[PDB]
Amino acid sequence: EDCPQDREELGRNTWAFLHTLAAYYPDMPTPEQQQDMAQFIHIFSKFYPCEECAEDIRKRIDRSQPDTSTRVSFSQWLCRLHNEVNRKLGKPDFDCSRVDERWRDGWKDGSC
Amino acid sequence: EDCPQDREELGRNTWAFLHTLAAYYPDMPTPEQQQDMAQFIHIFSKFYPCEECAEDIRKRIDRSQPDTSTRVSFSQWLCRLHNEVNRKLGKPDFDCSRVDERWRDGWKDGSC
Ligand SMILES: Cc1cc2nc3c(=O)[nH]c(=O)nc-3n(C[C@H](O)[C@H](O)[C@H](O)COP(=O)(O)OP(=O)(O)OC[C@H]3O[C@@H](n4cnc5c(N)ncnc54)[C@H](O)[C@@H]3O)c2cc1C
Numbered sequence: 001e002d003c004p005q006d007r008e009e010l011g012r013n014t015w016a017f018l019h020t021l022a023a024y025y026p027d028m029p030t031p032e033q034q035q036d037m038a039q040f041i042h043i044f045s046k047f048y049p050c051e052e053c054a055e056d057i058r059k060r061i062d063r064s065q066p067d068t069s070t071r072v073s074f075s076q077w078l079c080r081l082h083n084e085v086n087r088k089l090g091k092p093d094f095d096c097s098r099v100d101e102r103w104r105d106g107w108k109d110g111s112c
Numbered sequence: 113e114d115c116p117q118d119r120e121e122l123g124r125n126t127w128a129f130l131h132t133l134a135a136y137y138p139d140m141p142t143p144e145q146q147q148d149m150a151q152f153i154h155i156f157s158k159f160y161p162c163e164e165c166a167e168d169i170r171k172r173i174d175r176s177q178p179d180t181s182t183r184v185s186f187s188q189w190l191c192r193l194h195n196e197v198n199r200k201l202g203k204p205d206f207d208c209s210r211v212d213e214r215w216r217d218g219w220k221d222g223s224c
Pocket residue numbers: 007008009010011012013014015016019048052053054056057078079080081082083085086089091093094096099102114
C-alpha cells in the first residue's frame with residue numbers, strides 16, 4: 001500500500017515470495033544450488049522482520065531442515081512448514097499436493 | 113485472488129519483504145550478521161523467480177555490493193538498488209531519506 005506492513009501483510013507477502021521462489025527452484029538443482037537454498041532459508045529464519053515469527057520459524061526449521069534436493073522436495077517442505085504456522089494460528093491446512101496450482105500453474109479449473 | 117503472482121505482483125510483495133527486512137536489521141549488527149545479510153542478498157539475486165529480474169539485479173549488485181554495516185547503511189543501499197530498477201522501468205525515484213517512514217515508522221504526518 002503506502003504504509004509499513006503489519007504482521008499479517010508482511011506474512012502474506014513473504015509467503016508469496018517464498019512459495020514462488022520454491023515453485024521456480026530447479027527440478028534438477030546443482031549441489032551448489034542445493035547448498036545455497038538451504039543456507040538462504042537458514043539466514044532467512046534469522047532475519048525475518050516479525051520478531052516473534054522468526055523465533056518460532058527458527059525452532060520449526062531446526063527441527064525439520066529444508067530438503068532442497070529438488071523443486072518438489074523443497075516446495076513440499078516449504079508447504080509443510082507453512083502449514084505448521086497455519087495450525088498454530090488456527091488457519092486451515094493447505095493441500096500441499098496443489099502447491100503448483102496455487103503458486104505456479106494456476107488452478108486446473110482455470111479460475112486463474 | 114489466490115493465484116500465481118505475475119512479475120508486478122511478485123515484485124511489489126518482494127520489495128515489501130526486502131524493505132521491511134532492512135528496516136528491522138540491527139542498527140549494530142555483529143560481524144556474523146553482516147556476513148549473513150550480504151550472502152542473503154547474493155543468494156536472493158541468484159534465485160529470485162523472475163529470470164530477467166534476477167539477471168538485472170545481479171548486474172547492479174556486482175557494481176555496488178550490499179553495505180550491511182548497519183540498519184541505516186543497508187536500508188539506504190537497498191533503497192538505491194530499488195531506485196535503479198525504478199529508473200530502468202521509468203518509475204518515479206523514491207526519496208531514500210524517507211525509507212524509515214515508508215517501511216517502519218509511518219509517515220511523519222501521522223497518515224498511518
Ligand atoms: C516465516 C514466517 C513466520 C511467521 N510466523 C508467525 C507467527 O509466529 N505468528 C503469527 O501471528 N503470524 C506469523 N506469520 C504470519 C502468518 O503466517 C500469516 O502470513 C498472516 O497471519 C496472514 O495470514 P493469511 O491468512 O493472509 O495467509 P498466509 O499469509 O497464511 O497465506 C498465504 C496464502 O498462501 C496460501 N497458503 C496457505 N498455506 C499454504 C501452504 N502451506 N503452502 C502453500 N501455500 C499456502 C493461501 O492461498 C493463503 O491465502 C509468519 C510468516 C512467515 C512468512
